């Protein structure tokens, strides 16, 4: 029985491979030779956020591009004013081993989680301004690796149990369960319309999920090692992923295959975070070599390097308006970068 | 400075005072990590240090030794794959590694786990406290003679007891020979690399002796002193 099932699976895999190869008529690198190069990009540190005591693990930007939340393993979730650097709130966490945080699109709630397997949501618009745990989501059998708010009542979460779930804050129970991964789900990225989202796991594979239907549509296996970071193209039709193989790969949903690979021989360290600019031309990816690089999404050439961190850049986030880029490292300091003419 | 900006600056100063208080409380405390297979008496030592004080994801047990607060975390509900969440403990004071010395057939698994934890990219500067737990069972098994380490470890036939051995007065030469052989097998893996930036502190434990807290306290003190000394480039 198992032999026939494995044979059928291999046959279907070969069929999918042939279908993908038949449509591979031209590569992005070939047609992009006639586009003007971006050239060297220089960015300086405009703000230096300090106050954290442990290695910063994750951060997220607000819809207004003004407030940002940074999560550190010291048991604190602080909100920083990107303009004046003044802190707005210092939420004390019950679990010190936090690994991810999320800022609601409306700016009313903030989520966080980590090795505790619980997604703690805090309200920022309480009646007396006293931030408190609004709802605690439990049920995952693995460390909470990432979470992103879909609305003021729904949130998608990833866990190390190779499973993702769609939570409801009002009731506090899973609405939809997304399965199919074999490794620990590191992070996910929601599409601009919040209808579809992609997630990576520790199996060199990335899958596309439907929030309303809950069924997997496409699976990308272009990487060679665990996929740590992932970001969606501004249009919602492509996405890039960072892995420990020191190589980024751009995948398209329509083509169902990789478009471009970003790697350099001198780079042999794993990738930590990736993000797409407002236009998508600049692919900013963090690395474990204590610095970050800016890759040309169309030319696959190193346009710049955002160095100045004392440790690996564990997180990276770009504002909704692209005015600046935030990069956090394990040195407990968060740097904000922005170019000038 | 406008009134809104002044209120924001006042709130920021209050948050900074709170963060300074938290910084004092944090630097005044230490953290620890408890590792080991299921066959080891991890829960035993946990309960021992808990009752004396001197789904879930991660458990936490707080105990005090000589007015010094210590925080030991034990993995209660997590997936078998540990390559990811182990990186979170790359800044702990020490890693308490408990091993079942009486489990010959699984001793190789513990050795491989210790080798993996030692040669990690991010744990290069984290010390590991090796607890050879369950010594009574090892002594009983050695005295019985039914199972011999020669089968699981052929090189044991040529091993001799170290000269600096300090065995328990009423200890049989075979028991001390076997326990020191296990200790040296673990040390050869611990001493195979590291360049002296992180050390290992082996100890003989039974999961019931009340001195485990004192041993951990001494290990943490030694580690902190060696770290302070390395800042001055004396080591």
């Amino acid at each position, epitope marked *: 029985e198992l032999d026939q099932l*494995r044979q059928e699976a291999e046959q279907l*895999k070969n069929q999918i491979r042939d279908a993908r190869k038949a449509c591979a008529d031209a590569t992005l690198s070939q047609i992009t030779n006639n586009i003007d190069p971006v050239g060297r990009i220089q960015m300086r540190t405009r703000r230096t956020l300090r106050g954290h005591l442990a290695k910063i693990y994750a951060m997220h930007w607000g819809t207004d591009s003004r407030l940002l939340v940074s999560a550190s393993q010291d048991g604190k979730l602080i909100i920083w004013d990107s303009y004046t650097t003044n802190k707005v709130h210092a939420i004390p966490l019950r679990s010190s081993w936090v690994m991810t945080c999320a800022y609601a699109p409306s700016g009313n709630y903030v989520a966080c989680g980590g090795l505790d397997n619980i997604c703690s949501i805090y309200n920022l618009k309480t009646r007396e301004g006293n931030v408190r745990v609004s709802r605690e989501l439990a049920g995952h059998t693995g460390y909470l690796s990432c979470c992103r708010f879909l609305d003021d009542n729904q949130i998608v979460t990833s866990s190390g149990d190779t499973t993702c779930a769609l939570w409801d804050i009002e009731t506090g129970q899973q609405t939809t369960t997304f399965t199919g991964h*074999t*490794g620990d789900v590191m992070s996910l990225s929601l599409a601009p319309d919040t209808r579809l989202f992609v997630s990576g796991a*520790c*199996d*060199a*594979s990335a899958k596309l999920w439907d929030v309303r239907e809950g069924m997997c549509r496409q699976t990308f*296996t272009g990487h*060679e*090692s*665990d996929i740590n970071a992932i970001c969606f193209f501004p249009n919602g039709n492509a996405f890039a992923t960072g892995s*420990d*193989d*020191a190589t980024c790969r751009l995948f398209d949903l329509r083509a169902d295959q990789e478009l471009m690979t970003y790697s350099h021989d001198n780079i*042999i360290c*794993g990738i930590t975070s990736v993000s797409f600019s407002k236009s998508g031309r600049l692919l900013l990816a963090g690395y474990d070599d204590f610095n970050c690089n800016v890759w040309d999404a169309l030319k696959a050439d190193r346009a710049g390097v955002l160095a100045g961190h004392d440790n690996r850049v564990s997180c990276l986030g770009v504002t909704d308006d692209g005015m600046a880029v935030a990069t956090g490292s394990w040195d407990s300091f968060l740097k904000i970068w922005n170019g000038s003419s | 400075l406008s009134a809104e900006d002044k209120a924001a600056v006042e709130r920021s100063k209050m948050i900074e005072k709170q963060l300074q208080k938290d910084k004092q409380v944090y630097r005044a405390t230490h953290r620890l990590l408890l590792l080991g297979a299921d066959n080891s008496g991890k829960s035993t030592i946990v309960k021992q240090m808990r009752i004396y004080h001197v789904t879930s994801g991660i458990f936490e047990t707080k105990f005090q030794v000589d007015k010094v607060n210590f925080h030991m975390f034990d993995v209660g509900a997590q997936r*078998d*794959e*540990r*390559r990811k969440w*182990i990186q979170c403990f790359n800044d702990v004071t020490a890693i308490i590694f408990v091993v079942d010395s009486s489990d010959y057939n699984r001793l*190789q*698994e513990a050795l*491989n786990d210790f*080798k*993996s934890i030692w*040669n*990690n*990219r991010w744990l290069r500067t984290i010390s590991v406290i090796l607890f050879l737990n369950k010594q009574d069972l090892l002594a009983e098994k050695v005295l019985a003679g039914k199972s011999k380490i020669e089968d*699981y*470890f*052929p*090189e044991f036939a040529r091993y001799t007891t170290p000269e600096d051995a300090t065995p328990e007065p009423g200890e049989d030469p075979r028991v001390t020979r076997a326990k020191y052989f296990i200790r040296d097998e673990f040390l050869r893996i611990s001493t195979a690399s590291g360049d002296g930036r992180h050390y290992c502190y082996p100890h003989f434990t039974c999961s019931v002796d009340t001195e485990n807290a004192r041993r951990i306290f001494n290990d943490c003190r030694d580690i902190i002193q060696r770290m302070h000394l390395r800042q001055y480039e004396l080591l």
Partner: nanobody
Amino acid sequence: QVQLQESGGGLVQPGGSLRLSCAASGFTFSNYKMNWVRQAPGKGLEWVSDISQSGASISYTGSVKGRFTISRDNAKNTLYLQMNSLKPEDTAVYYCARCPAPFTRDCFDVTSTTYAYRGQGTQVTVSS
């Protein structure tokens, strides 16, 4: 896609010889460490041997020390495990596992219940 296809197995008399093979594809075989794992009937996965990137440093478990020989061909991207003087206790499905990350010295969870970068293994039964 990363895939490992082990080879070699079947009935083998105790004390004889048997040569296993594994085909590597989907990655730079030279940039990853290779480790051998087996699962005996009624027992869990156990580490057998490992080979470095260039093959300079090689180690074996005490149960197979001096009995098995592990070697890799960076050109052919194939791993070999020359097994001689087999014993009835060696009956187990040998699985080939790869280090999760490249340019590293630690194989954290190669011997895990649900490792991703491992092959299906081959049946090895040592019975007279």
